[PDB]
Design an enzyme around this catalytic site. Structure first.
Site, PDB file in Angstrom:
ATOM      1  CB  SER A  79      25.476  48.836  44.089  1.00 54.00           C
ATOM      2  OG  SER A  79      25.712  48.712  45.468  1.00 54.00           O
ATOM      3  NE  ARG A 328      32.460  47.615  38.585  1.00 52.43           N
ATOM      4  CZ  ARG A 328      33.743  47.901  38.782  1.00 52.43           C
ATOM      5  NH1 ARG A 328      34.629  46.922  38.940  1.00 52.43           N
ATOM      6  NH2 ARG A 328      34.141  49.162  38.924  1.00 52.43           N
ATOM      7  CB  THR A 364      28.002  53.242  48.585  1.00 53.09           C
ATOM      8  OG1 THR A 364      27.820  52.145  47.683  1.00 53.09           O
ATOM      9  CG2 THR A 364      27.611  54.570  47.921  1.00 53.09           C
ATOM     10  CB  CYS A 525      33.423  35.319  31.692  1.00 58.82           C
ATOM     11  SG  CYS A 525      32.755  36.703  30.759  1.00 58.82           S
ATOM     12  CB  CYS A 550      33.045  42.948  27.884  1.00 62.85           C
ATOM     13  SG  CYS A 550      34.095  43.240  29.344  1.00 62.85           S
ATOM     14  CB  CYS A 553      32.186  42.139  36.040  1.00 60.87           C
ATOM     15  SG  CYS A 553      33.089  40.723  35.352  1.00 60.87           S
ATOM     16  CB  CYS A 556      38.427  37.763  32.886  1.00 64.42           C
ATOM     17  SG  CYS A 556      38.280  39.426  32.265  1.00 64.42           S
TER      18      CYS A 556
END
Ligand SMILES: Cc1cc2nc3c(=O)[nH]c(=O)nc-3n(C[C@H](O)[C@H](O)[C@H](O)COP(=O)(O)OP(=O)(O)OC[C@H]3O[C@@H](n4cnc5c(N)ncnc54)[C@H](O)[C@@H]3O)c2cc1C
Ligand SMILES: COC1=C(OC)C(=O)C(C/C=C(\C)CC/C=C(\C)CC/C=C(\C)CC/C=C(\C)CCC=C(C)C)=C(C)C1=O
Ligand SMILES: CCCCCCO[C@@H]1O[C@H](CO)[C@@H](O)[C@H](O)[C@H]1O
Ligand SMILES: CCCCCCO[C@@H]1O[C@H](CO)[C@@H](O)[C@H](O)[C@H]1O
Ligand code: SF4
Ligand code: NA
Length: 581
Positions: A79, A328, A364, A525, A550, A553, A556
């Site tokens: 975040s 993310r 959040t 990506c 990877c 996130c 894709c």
């Protein structure tokens, strides 16, 4: 060997259908609990915490199991993090002396519109949503870690390193629980001498808190037709890096945001730059791009790296050190995109269903409140008779009733038209104008709700109709390449396991994507997972999947124009090793 059946995951090629698994016993041990929670994010921890609090207040026995993908709690947490304390202080009025890391109260809010050469400052009034009076700048990763600490102290059974890989159903059709990932399967799908079956966790009600674009929720939506009365979710991708800068340019408590360059007016996105006040001259910064972008040549990573060179920003990080990198996806569909959050045997909370206030860039506080409410409602149903049935699994519908009546609902309702208003001829600038009129002046009272343009996945134009974007080469000091960036994420996986980035048809990435859109997967990506390798025999390419890079996130699975990809969890413990991100 070949073209390479990039896809060998059991979810696409059931091992109940392939001879290599003939002798293997698939019997799993099982554990019984009252509530099982999937995801140790702020929502999952809020739910767990509160449930064990409600249990203590009323002296009842409650077994609560919390499973998380991350090697350790807070490791997959990304975040920028400007926190609205509202729901947090509700869960922990006691936080200050209990040690929660809210050490940076926001002291200054700045916003500017960028051009290639300049920055236009924009007046931030108390009436706009980008006002942070009363908020804290925090390293969400650390706050989450802190929360997992309180949760455990309360008796919650926390299981980091365990990924929920399969939803369990009772024969009546309701959710029984989940099973953790199996372990010890080689890249080709064959069982290893060390093969080990996952763990089954049974509960009266399972809470799903996987965050933005959860892979179990994606199938849950299908199973119980939860999107029946809602527009599909819309997303953006967030890239972020941590920096240590020159004390002389460190302005603790300062929160910066920008729009404009390097994005054209029809591409939604922007930056964030927050000065942390936790002892070091530290900066949390990053970039966001709506996955509803149209150019197949656009690269959100390159946009971010290129953004740092703008003259109003580069001097700030000059002489600085970049110490971490992560990415993310986030929700931006807001209010119009909230699905039904309940079904026999389970609940959806946090950004998985999506309670993000996009103009405030905050999800959040609402994710926390949803966790608090789902807990109160569940404990409420476990503490009565007033028996609902034929679904062994509880249908805690009261959760959605109460969420609809909490401040969460009205907050999201009030800023519902801001993101969609960006689809006009003036693009994001039209959105700003719309925000000054209908929000700043009318606080969103307008007698209507705007719609989104559809799924981010069909927003791409064919490559032949677009112009490639010429990105600058990184300079190794302000801008960097993808590989070094992936290294600063500390992400890693056991190489010998099938790719968790599964394809439904192994030929569409080369036949459709590369053919029509020029392989957008090589640019959207943020980790360099998909690459098209020159073919050995004669003329084309083959797609290679470097699943080990990877960062989870979820982009894709969201942006593929052919919706041919399905992200699933890799062995538990794999992925980013984020520290206070
Ligand atoms: C770049 C960026 C900047 C942001 N800035 C802000 C800001 O300033 N303020 C604000 O309030 N919000 C901000 N947000 C949003 C905020 O991070 C989210 O709203 C919030 O984290 C959502 O919380 P959550 O609890 O639902 O889940 P998440 O934090 O998304 O966590 C979900 C967890 O579930 C785990 N998980 C997923 N699937 C499985 C599974 N199958 N089995 C086991 N574990 C699983 C994941 O590993 C992850 O830890 C930002 C987001 C991004 C990407
Ligand atoms: C880093 O994340 C991001 C933001 O956040 C920092 C963003 O903003 C945007 C883009 C724009 C949006 C979402 C519309 C939001 C509204 C804003 C930012 C308000 C600011 C300025 C206004 C309202 C100007 C005043 C209006 C006038 C003068 C109209 C004329 C008449 C009157 C009302 C008196 C993006 C893409 C983004 O990624
Ligand atoms: C039609 C315009 C009328 C005058 C507005 C006056 O004062 C206003 O106070 C609020 C705080 O409540 C701010 O958000 C506004 O930006 C500020 O202009
Ligand atoms: C600006 C981006 C999306 C919003 C669509 C709104 O356009 C409409 O325009 C007319 C003027 O022709 C107003 O009278 C209406 O109240 C307004 O809703
Ligand atoms: S493969 Fe997918 S989920 Fe993993 S980092 Fe790349 S886009 Fe994100
Ligand atoms: Na709706």
């Amino acid at each position: 060997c070949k073209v390479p059946r990039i896809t060998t995951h059991y979810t696409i090629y059931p091992r109940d259908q392939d001879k290599r698994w003939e002798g293997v016993n698939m019997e799993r041990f099982a554990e019984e609990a009252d509530v099982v929670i999937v995801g140790a994010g702020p929502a999952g921890l809020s739910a767990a915490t509160r449930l064990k609090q409600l249990a203590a207040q009323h002296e009842k026995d409650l077994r609560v199991c919390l499973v998380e993908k991350a090697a350790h709690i807070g490791a997959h947490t990304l975040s920028g993090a400007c926190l609205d304390p509202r729901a947090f202080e509700e869960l922990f009025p006691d936080w200050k002396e209990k040690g929660a890391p809210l050490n940076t109260p926001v002291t200054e809010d700045r916003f500017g519109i960028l051009t290639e050469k300049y920055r236009i400052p924009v007046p931030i009034l108390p009436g706009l949503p980008m006002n942070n009076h009363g908020n804290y700048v925090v390293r969400l990763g650390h706050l989450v870690s802190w929360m997992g600490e309180q949760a455990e102290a309360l008796g919650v059974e926390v299981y980091p390193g365990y990924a929920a890989a399969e939803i369990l159903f009772h024969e009546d059709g309701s959710v029984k629980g989940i099973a953790t990932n199996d372990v010890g399967i080689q890249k080709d799908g064959a069982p290893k001498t060390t093969f080990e079956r996952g763990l089954e966790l049974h509960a009266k009600v399972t809470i799903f808190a996987e965050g933005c674009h959860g892979h179990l929720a994606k199938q849950l939506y299908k199973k119980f037709d939860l999107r029946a009365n809602c527009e599909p979710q819309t997303y953006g991708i967030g890239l972020k890096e941590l920096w240590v800068i020159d004390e002389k340019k460190w302005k603790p408590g300062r929160v910066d945001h920008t729009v404009g360059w390097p994005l054209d007016r029809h591409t939604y996105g922007g930056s964030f730059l927050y000065h942390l006040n936790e002892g070091e001259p530290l900066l949390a910064l990053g970039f966001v791009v709506g996955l509803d972008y149209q150019n197949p040549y656009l690269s959100p990573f390159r946009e971010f790296q290129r953004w740092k060179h703008h003259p109003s920003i580069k001097p700030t990080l000059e002489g600085g050190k970049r110490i971490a990198y992560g990415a993310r996806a986030l929700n931006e569909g807001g209010f119009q995109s909230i699905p039904k959050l309940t079904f026999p045997g389970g609940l959806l909370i946090g950004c998985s269903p999506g309670f993000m206030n996009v103009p405030k860039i905050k999800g959040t506080h609402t994710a926390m409140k949803s966790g608090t409410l789902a807990a109160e409602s569940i404990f409420n149903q476990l503490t009565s008779e007033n028996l609902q049935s034929k679904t062994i699994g509880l249908h805690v519908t009261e959760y959605e009733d109460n969420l609809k009546n909490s401040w969460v609902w009205k907050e999201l309702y009030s800023v519902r038209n801001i993101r969609p208003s960006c689809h006009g001829i003036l693009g994001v600038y039209g959105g700003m104008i719309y925000t000054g009129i209908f929000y700043w002046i009318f606080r969103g009272m307008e007698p209507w709700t705007l719609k989104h343009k559809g799924s981010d996945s069909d927003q791409l134009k064919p490559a032949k109709d677009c112009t490639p974007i010429e990105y600058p080469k990184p300079d190794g000091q302000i801008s960097f390449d993808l590989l070094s960036s992936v290294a600063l994420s500390g992400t890693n996986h056991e190489h010998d396991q099938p790719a968790h980035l599964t394809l439904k048809d192994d030929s569409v990435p080369v036949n459709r994507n590369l053919s029509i859109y020029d392989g957008p997967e090589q640019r959207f990506c943020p980790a360099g997972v998909y690459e098209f390798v020159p073919l050995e025999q004669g003329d084309g390419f083959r797609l290679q999947i470097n699943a080990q890079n990877c960062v989870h996130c979820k982009t894709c699975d969201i942006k593929d124009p052919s919706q041919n990809i399905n992200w699933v969890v890799p062995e538990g413990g794999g992925g980013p090793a984020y520290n206070g991100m």
